[PDB]
Amino acid sequence: VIDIFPTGQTMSFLRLLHGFLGTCRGQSMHQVLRDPCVLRKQLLYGVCKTLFDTITVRRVAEEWKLHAQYLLVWSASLRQSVQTGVLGALRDILYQYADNDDYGLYVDWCVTVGLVPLLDVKTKPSEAAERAQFVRAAVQRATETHPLAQDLLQANLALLLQVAERLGAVRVANAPEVRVFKKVRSERLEAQLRGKHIRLYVAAEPLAYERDKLLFTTPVAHLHEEILRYDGLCRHQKICQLLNTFPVKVVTADAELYHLPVLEAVRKARDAAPFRPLAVEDNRLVANSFFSQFVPGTESLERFLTQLWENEYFRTFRLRRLVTHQGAEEAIVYSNYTVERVTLPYLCHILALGTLDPVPEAYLQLSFGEIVAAAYDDSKFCRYVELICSREKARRRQMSR
């Protein structure tokens, strides 16, 4: 019966992720793993590895028989026509079907609260017949560049129609009236939406120890109070600089000033902040006075909050850095650990489970075009073109003896 999401803490706990109250140079550190189009490369790798693994020698050696140093240039002229060849059919199936947002809300939820919901849809034949037509008409970029790619997609059309039925059916809801429950009697984690039950899953499940009170193992609750402290100091600092701009104080008992010359500027400055004194009547009116010129030091703990965000996200998820000479930081890529830790559990319970593989760390950095070649070296076709180019060179080598 205990609420989790729409309470006095958890709404602000999501508002601190974007720029509402505080911002330092480490709020962008969340963005480097909030990015989509890493799931695109991972599912592309996990579909092409299966796509290059259900072929025998008999289908492809007949192409060498119909192909009649000569037996080594034949490899790349089949590799290049299958590099772009399957990729043209692999690009257009993704961008017409894969929503960019759906990975973003999950990683915006899982690092923040840990209780990410998800939605399902009922599949009428109109919703699936357009997809069945598009996967059939995806042969057209496998026509002119490669005579083999149509047969390869004809062989492996099962996974291609399999991926087209989950990936556009699940949605992490950006709905207004959504909340997750905490049940107290036979305790469970159920989710509600519009007054109806709905699937959720735990990955960062809270630490229920006190009655009517929760603890969160999320990365943001470690620095929630400090990133609130930064705003509680920033608005303090701007209210502290504000009330002592008038240079002479005494106790008794728009933006046009760039455009205009200074003789109007100094004239307007005296009347834009008039001389208002400060006084309180007394009976025995003897005063003794002091003065406090003051600011609070905002520079001294922003370089603490930046090395809180940056030295927190490099400890939760272990993001790899690419540093050059004189220590200059460059763009930040996934490691082999964080792809398995945040993209793969999104793959094993939100998307199609049980066929795909996590991409290595170096292959995530490469080009969108070169990843199919990088999986082609890791697949069987390199070890089939070497076997064919060795057996046929032996058969046409032994004719001299």
258 near its own copies, judged by CB under 8 A: yes
Count the residues of the shown chain that bind its own copies, applying the rule CB under 8 A.
186
Which of residues 101, 120, 127, 190 is near its own copies by CB under 8 A? 101
The least distance separating its own copies from the CB of residue 63, rounded to whole angstroms, comes to 15
Applying the rule CB under 8 A, the residues between 107 and 146 that interact with its own copies are 108, 141, 144-145
- 189 touches 115 (CB < 8 A): yes
The least distance separating its own copies from the CB of residue 140, rounded to whole angstroms, comes to 8
Task: Specify the 3-state DSSP secondary structure of 168.
Answer: coil
Structure tokens at 390: 């060795």
- 373 touches 55 (CB < 8 A): no
> How many whole angstroms separate alpha carbon 331 and alpha carbon 345?
24
- 139 touches 40 (CB < 8 A): no
CB atoms within 10 A of CB 13: 18
49 near its own copies, judged by CB under 8 A: yes
The least distance separating its own copies from the CB of residue 187, rounded to whole angstroms, comes to 8
**Interior angle at CA 107, CA 304 and CA 205, nearest 5:** 90
Nearest to 81 by CA among 69, 93, 73: 73
Which of residues 122, 125, 194, 209 is near its own copies by CB under 8 A? 209
Which of residues 59, 197, 321, 396 is near its own copies by CB under 8 A? 321
Q: Give the position of tokens 């693994």.
A: 53
Structure tokens at 299: 């520079």
- 111 touches 219 (CB < 8 A): yes
Applying the rule CB under 8 A, the residues between 150 and 169 that interact with its own copies are none
Radius of gyration of the chain (CA): 32
Task: Specify the 3-state DSSP secondary structure of 200.
Answer: strand
Window 167-206: contact mask with its own copies (x via CB under 8 A): -------xxx-x--------x--------------xxxxx
Which of residues 198, 349, 374, 392 is near its own copies by CB under 8 A? 349
What does DSSP say about strands 196-198 and 191-193: parallel, antiparallel, or unpaired? Answer: antiparallel
Applying the rule CB under 8 A, the residues between 290 and 309 that interact with its own copies are 290-302, 304, 307-308
The least distance separating its own copies from the CB of residue 390, rounded to whole angstroms, comes to 6
Which of residues 58, 263, 399, 400 is near its own copies by CB under 8 A? 263
The least distance separating its own copies from the CB of residue 158, rounded to whole angstroms, comes to 10
Q: After which residues is the chain broken (C to N over 2.5 A)?
A: 68, 253
Applying the rule CB under 8 A, the residues between 6 and 35 that interact with its own copies are 11, 14-15, 18-21, 23-25, 27-29, 31-32, 35
Applying the rule CB under 8 A, the residues between 63 and 92 that interact with its own copies are 69-70, 73, 76-77, 80-81, 84, 87-88, 91-92
**Closer to its own copies at the Cβ: 100 or 154?**
100
Options 58-66, 119-127, 162-170, 347-355: segment touching its own copies (CB under 8 A): 347-355
